[PDB]
Amino acid sequence: QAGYDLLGDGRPETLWLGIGTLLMLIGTFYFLVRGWGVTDKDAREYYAVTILVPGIASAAYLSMFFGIGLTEVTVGGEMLDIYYARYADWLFTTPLLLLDLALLAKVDRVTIGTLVGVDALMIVTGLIGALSHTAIARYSWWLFSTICMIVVLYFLATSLRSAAKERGPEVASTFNTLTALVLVLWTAYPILWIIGTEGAGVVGLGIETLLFMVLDVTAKVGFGFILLRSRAILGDTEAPE
Ligand SMILES: *C/C=C(C)/C=C/C=C(C)/C=C/C1=C(C)CCCC1(C)C
Ligand SMILES: CCCCCCCCCCCCCCCC
Ligand SMILES: CCCCCCCCCCCCCCCC
Ligand SMILES: CCCCCCCCCCCCCCCC
Ligand SMILES: CCCCCCCCC
Ligand SMILES: CCCCCCCCC
Ligand SMILES: [Ca+2]
Ligand SMILES: [Cl-]
Ligand SMILES: [Cl-]
Ligand SMILES: [Cl-]
Ligand code: NA
C-alpha cells in the first residue's frame, strides 16, 4: 500500500493516519480555544456540538494509528484489513453534523429523529457490508447504505433547506454553503468505498486511507470552520430536548 510504515509494524497507511490525527487534534483545539470567548447561548450550542466532531475523530484516528481495533476479513482467498474505529467514528460524528444543520434549519424533533435514524442505518449497513464474506453481499449492503445516504441528503436539500430560508438570509446563506458542501463530500464516501479495498480493489489500502483522511478533515474541520465563523450561530435555537 501507498505510504510509509511509520511504526515499523508493516502498515504503510499509518502515515496518513498520523497526519489525520494531527489535523483533527489541531482543529479540535482551534475550535475549543475559539469557543471559550463565546457567551451567546445559541452559539455555545453550536460550539458544543461542533467541537465534538473532530474531537471524537481525533480519538478514532489515534486508535487506528496504533492498530487498536484492527482485524482481518477473508473474502475468498484474499485478506482485507478493516478498522472498526473508522465506522464508530462515523456513527457518532455524522449525527452531530446533521444536528448542526438541523439547528440552523430549526426543524422539529420528529424531523431530526428520522434524519439521524436513517443516517445510523447507513453506517451500520456499511459496516455489515465491510464484514460480509461474499462479493455479492458486499455490493448489496453498499447499495442499501447508499440509498439511505440519498434519503438523508434529500431531506437536507428539500425539507431542511425550505425551513432554513424562513429564518432570514443570514442563516439561509450559511445553510446553503454547508449543504452544498455536504452533498458533494458525503457522496464521495460510497464512491471511494466501492472502488477501494472493500469493493472492486482498484484503489489499494494506502491511497484509500489517504483519500478517506482528506474527506474526514474536510467534512469535520472544514465544515466547522465555515459554520463557527458565520453570524448564523447567534440566532435563536431549539434543541430537540
Ligand atoms: C465526518 C465523517 C463523515 C461525515 C463520514 C461520512 C460517511 C459516509 C457518508 C459513508 C457512506 C457509505 C455508503 C453510503 C455506502 C456503504 C459504505 C459507506 C459507509 C462508506
Ligand atoms: C413530522 C416530520 C417528519 C416525518 C417523517 C416521515 C417520513 C419518514 C420517512 C422514513 C424513511 C425510512 C427510510 C428507510 C430506509 C430506506
Ligand atoms: C436536488 C437533489 C438533492 C439530492 C441529491 C443527492 C445526490 C447528490 C449528488 C452529488 C454528486 C456529486 C458528484 C461529485 C462526486 C465526486
Ligand atoms: C518517505 C516519506 C514520504 C512522505 C511523503 C509525504 C507526502 C506529503 C503528505 C502531505 C499530507 C497530505 C495532505 C492532506 C491534507 C488534507
Ligand atoms: C470538548 C472536547 C471534546 C473532545 C472529545 C474527546 C473524546 C474523548 C474520547
Ligand atoms: C480515546 C483515545 C484512545 C487512544 C489509544 C492510544 C493507545 C496508545 C498505546
Ligand atoms: Ca442568541
Ligand atoms: Cl458570543
Ligand atoms: Cl445569550
Ligand atoms: Cl495503495
Ligand atoms: Na506503521
Q: What is the CATH number for 88?
A: 1.20.1070.10
What CA–CA distance (Å, rounded) separates 34 from 24? 15
219, 177, 212: which is closest to 192 by C-alpha?
Answer: 212
List the determination method: X-ray
Q: Domain count of the chain?
A: 1
Residue nearest to atom 4 of ligand 6 (CA): 63
> In degrees to the nearest 10, what's the CA dihedral of 139, 145, 149, 151?
110
Please state the atom number of ligand 3 nearest to the C-alpha of residue 154: 4
Whether 179 contacts 209, CB under 8 Å: no
Residue type, 240: P
Q: Which atom of ligand 3 is nearest to the CA of 150?
A: 6
Amino acid found at 29? F
Resolution (A): 2.2
Task: Give me the DSSP letters along 99-133.
Answer: HHHHHHHT--HHHHHHHHHHHHHHHHHHHHHHH-S
Look up the domain containing 114 and give its range: 2-241
Rounded Cα distance between 27 and 34, Å, is 11
Cα angle 145, 151, 157; round to 5: 135
* 184 CA to centre of ligand 5 in angstroms: 27
Is residue 95 a contact partner of residue 124, using CB atoms and an 8 Å limit?
A: no
Q: Return the residue whose CA atom lies nearest to atom 14 of ligand 3.
A: 184
- Full DSSP string of 189-227: HHHHHHHSTTTT--S-HHHHHHHHHHHHHIIIIIHHHHH
Nearest to 13 by CA among 92, 83, 90: 83
Closest atom of ligand 6 relative to the 65 alpha carbon: 6
CA atoms of 202 and 208, how far apart (whole Å): 10
